[model samples]
Target: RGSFVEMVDNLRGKSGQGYYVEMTVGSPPQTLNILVDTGSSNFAVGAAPHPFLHRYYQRQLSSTYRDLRKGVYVPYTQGKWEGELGTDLVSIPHGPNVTVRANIAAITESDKFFINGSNWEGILGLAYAEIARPDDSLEPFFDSLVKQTHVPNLFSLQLCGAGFPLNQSEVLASVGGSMIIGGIDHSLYTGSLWYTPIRREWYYEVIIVRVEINGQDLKMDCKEYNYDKSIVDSGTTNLRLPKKVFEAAVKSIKAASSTEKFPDGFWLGEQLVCWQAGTTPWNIFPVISLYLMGEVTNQSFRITILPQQYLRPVEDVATSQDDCYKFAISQSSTGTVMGAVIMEGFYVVFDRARKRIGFAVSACHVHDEFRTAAVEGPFVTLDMEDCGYN
Candidate 1:
């Protein structure tokens, strides 16, 4: 089974070209291809044709683009978007190519300065927040669709990656994959629904009642455990972790894997982490269990905890605040990312209308050596334009 369904219509721009998603709009209009992300609620890009914060795009662009600098302010992980509110035409990739005159906003500033030019254009946010705050917005991206199109109120994303069945073997896949806006195929999974609450507004979240390692309980303390926001994200690949939880978990995982010694430091892609001795990598089924609503799904609560290699090294041999360190996993702290590494054979469901998330375990029938294939699946690189890696 695969993570994505084969047939469905995608939403495109009027030109029938890929949506001019968040991209390097420098010198000329360098539109970087991106998936319309309702999961995240911000409009950001790295580079742009104009200086981005220009007065025209900010206050004078249109009414749909609101310059919420006065009544409310929104801050991203890096920068922010300051613009007026307005609507524009958006083409849905449905058969007959329906173009919905969407009530979208144009942001003046992309979140560039926050992450060293790692900002992309903007995220067409599709949440239910219209009230403005530091990290919250009053107007979500989906509202525009519902207000204008008068169509179904639900949304879903199915990411088709290299591990998917019948994936194209020749081309090197990318970082962000495809994102379907409205629907999904239920037949892909066994329909054994395992859902969690929306603890945070961004992605579907659940309380990790307990974590069992080798059939034994490992303990740590937190007011509430947010099971890596990225775990709920269909966009990112690298699994991000809450530093404290990760350190403890990795200890048990590494010990189970029998890493007696290392020459210096070894980089492990997703496959190596859960691989076993002979029977198709024991790590693949490490049996990390999560309890929700009196149901337990082993290995269902997952995240990509390590990188293929460290970009750098840990300053202190023991521990450090920097995330790039050996114990720090990836150089990010945006909660944890449920990367494709752990989502290999799971059919993920993001039910926007119901405000919940679902998943069904699957068996990977295809073998993929392509590392970048995780990003190039059905999701788009809406936020990855700033890094230049993809």
Candidate 2:
């Protein structure tokens, strides 16, 4: 049986960075904190500052470490890293007792890499090898494990909002979650898993057929633009949508909640439109469902995002306010990136071999009625009864 590694969410008020896991690298086994990013495919470390900088991989310290004398520049939405490419033994402490001589990028310089102050020291990208650099010859850490070991060609993530306060001051809290390498954990989620075909292997890109709120479609002008594609990214904190689509969704949310909103402002350097936290009942907020194309069948599977999942409260440092409710933001060029906010309370599976992704209502958040809906199988029909809309 394969094992699971703990993934902790380092939420700093409105920063909402992402989840991180602890793993050992090199021959002597130096444990380091790494971000579990499904959006990219490069395993790199080293950042700015004192104690955090101490976690950087010291090439001379590990017997198994090999510097390839080759360097690469990787760019991200917010930052980039220039580093030396090499290979080393990487092992997950609590996971399967398997050590992989995986390809790694040892960062020599970082530009605007905001991970400096957080608990995470590095990033472990889990996307397909196609996105990896150096002529795509280098395999990602997880891919190497699947080939070298008897582990299943799958990984699962269950994100939690465990320590977040529903009605109090927004503070940095450690969110608890788990990353299961090789298989799924039945205890994490309720109901049968609903599988969606991966439209693209580069990222866990899925074809979203439709998006609805409270049985009413939050219609997108799909004819004018391609808004049907979305990436299930654990690296991103807030959902990133096309500008027009974001506007339409926000308009729907504003209309549904019947609350006045604040103009977009900088929160932790990111532009966000927030609302007064307790002015409206969040449970009564509309339930958003994403209809995605199924892998095995021609039908579509629904992934529900409850109000408790999307609606978040954070402190507005500029205004000295704690009543702000954080939501999706507009990024016209990036398409759609479904991040930790929407993924919370859902057991998500990335099946690389099957070229599909799976979703199940997490037992960590759903009610007892939904628990009874749990079934044993690869895929199950969405139970409208547990959809949680009045």
Candidate 3:
């Protein structure tokens, strides 16, 4: 059986930021912290000095390290990374204790925004082969793991919400959540897992039939939301939608809450939408539901997002008389990007081989409630009581 790797959420620095995991690189096993990103396909580490060890990956230090001498540039939403291509032995601390001679990007140049405030050293791309960089000519780390038969062609992510304390060391130790490679942890989620067919291999793309706010669909007939494509990305913190759809949703939220319009720049910085303290979002805001296409019978599978899931209190601030906000924002992008804000309460499964994604209500908040079912193919209701390793 494979194992579960612990992931840390960098909330203290930025609200609902990136999730990181530890991995050993090179023959001597140099410990490095890498971001687990599902939005892109590239595993690259920074060549900058480590804050603690004051050391970085030196090709001369690892006998197994091979430099391809190929320079590659990866552009992201916030910043871009430029580096050379290389391959070396990489090992996961947990999960089957498997090591692979995997391809990696040795980042030599990066902008300040690209560095993520020294939060992570590199990014471990978990999307698809189609989006792989460097001429799209290399296999990703997870793909290699599947080919080696070291693990199943699946991975699960259970993301913790913003309710956790933001103490860096303490949060790193006690908060965040779990990532299971090659298997599913029944204890992490509740109810039956809903399966959705992956429309495209790149970015875990799926077809969204419709999006509703409090059972009322948004009037916007934009292609980005109505019959538009969307992706569930853990790499992103805020839910991004088209400009029109976003404005419509915000209008609906404002109308439903019956509150005065927020002042200008209300959504500036990390705050999305803030309100006076003591105001419960569940009573004021509406529930958002996304109808996605199912893999079984082309049925419409619904993934509901409760108000509490999106409505999170501001961190470290005086909330007794201050304002609490929800973690959603509007974007001018074309497609919808479902980030950690919406993924917090759901157990998400990425089935690469089958080209599908699964979602179920998470049991992290209510662990005593048990859901049962026999393991069927790659898609099945995972029994919470099962003690199967991995």
Candidate 4:
């Protein structure tokens, strides 16, 4: 009995209407769809704006919409859509039978960009604090019900593929199957819970020591102490890297590859790099570590490094020189992020009351020796190849 099932169960929710919207932005209007995720907070879009600002914008235009004029003026250094807070009505399709008016911000500005080849329009901030505001964000909407309803209304998000229906295998975002309140999914991991303190600013900010190749450490030329604001987002499903760090990591991992240069970037050909055991004593298995700090608890994560096959070369097909190897990179200027796919079978707790996030380490049963399964529950049959850690 592996821990995968228990972990998955922890994320399972009973039922809830999915909240999302479709945006058609750009000069000619390119249509893009985005989810109104209540689990985390932040509103943004990948692409730039056309007219940029409206005197009288209302929620009638979009689903899970919000007006930013009512709430505090929150500024984003990342994606498009900038303005103060406003109120919007929110309705869940199925799970809960209550309609609540919530606060939402309209997009004011943006830097047009591409993410994994898809054009991103915008995001509706739905984190705990954002939802719970005097201006409604999804976080507070759920919290209000969770406290009064006594139903333990919970939500879970699983992003499996892409936004396009044709790209079904790329990602999956199902709320009831896995994302549920009080019910945690048992398909991923379920073991010991390693709690970390939340950052006061944005989401949970974790300190990453360095990105390692196999067992070797990759040096970052940038002058940043720790990787701050590495949020565990339920909305994203891939690991996004900063352009420079991504390039350097590819070089370190593919140093021994016969084809040293890839037009798209470097790929892991055949060689495997292993970290020395002495450097990470707590590493029960051969793992790559990223050290982080917490408000009450300090934690370090050892993400199992998958071979090059798990990654691919990202090409700027039109601009030959601009291409590089990437797991999945965002063209937007919102820095870099490690999305949901990077955290499959693990327990992630986003405590809005405490503004803290805790990730409990669990192992998939594929490699049984070093890693531990996530929890003690029914195992969700998963293909080893799908895990990407072969």
lDDT of 1 by residue, 1-390 (tens): 332343332322210011223322222223343434434554333222455322122223323332333322356565655544443344433311234443334443444432212222344544446332233434554565566665455554433333211212222232222344455455444435555544455444444444545555556532223424333543344445566656666666566556343222442322112112222232322334433321222222321111221111222233333222221133245555554333433545566566566655432212324321111112121212121111
Clashing pairs in 3: 3-95
TM-score of 1: 0.57
Ranking by TM-score: 3, 2, 1, 4
Candidate 3 residue-wise lDDT, 1-390, digit = tens = 222433222222223557767777898888776777888788888765544323456767888999888898877666877888899998877554688888888888776534434356777898887888976688888887778765888888877664533545654555466677887777777778888777778778876666678779775442447224578888777777767677787777667766555544544335445445544344555667776666655345677776666555454454445455644655646478887767776888998767889888865431111221111223222221121111
Q: For model 4, how does the per-residue alpha-carbon lDDT over 1-390 read when each residue is reduced to its tens digit?
A: 422232232221111112234433222233444444533564434322354221223335455453444423333344433445554444333334444554334444434322332222345454546333234333444554566455344343332221111222322233212333333344433454444444443444444434555557676632232222345554554455555555666566446343333444223222222223323212322233333343332224344433221232232334333322233333223334545444443445555555555554433222223543232212122221121111
The alpha-carbon deviation from the true structure for residue 337 of candidate 3, after best TM-score superposition, in angstroms, is 0.6
Stretches off by above 4 angstroms in model 1 are 1-32, 36-39, 43-47, 50-85, 94-98, 101-122, 130-137, 163-178, 200-203, 221-224, 227-231, 260-287, 293-334, 362-390
The local lDDT score (0 to 100) that residue 84 gets in candidate 4 is 54
Greater lDDT among 2 and 4 belongs to 2
Indicate the worst ten consecutive residues by lDDT in candidate 3: 381-390
lDDT of 2 by residue, 1-390 (tens): 223433222222222656677788898987877888898888987722434454677777889998888988977667877888888999987677789889888888877774544566788899988888765788888889998999899988877664234322232344456778888877777777988777778878876656676668876543212354478888887766666767777677667766544444432225544446544345446677666666544456677676666655454546644355555444555667788876775788998878888888876553222222122233343432222112
lDDT of each: 0.38, 0.67, 0.66, 0.38
Ranking under lDDT, best-scoring first?
2, 3, 4, 1
The whole-model C-alpha lDDT of candidate 2 against the native structure comes to 0.67
Candidate 2: the clashing residue pairs are 191-374
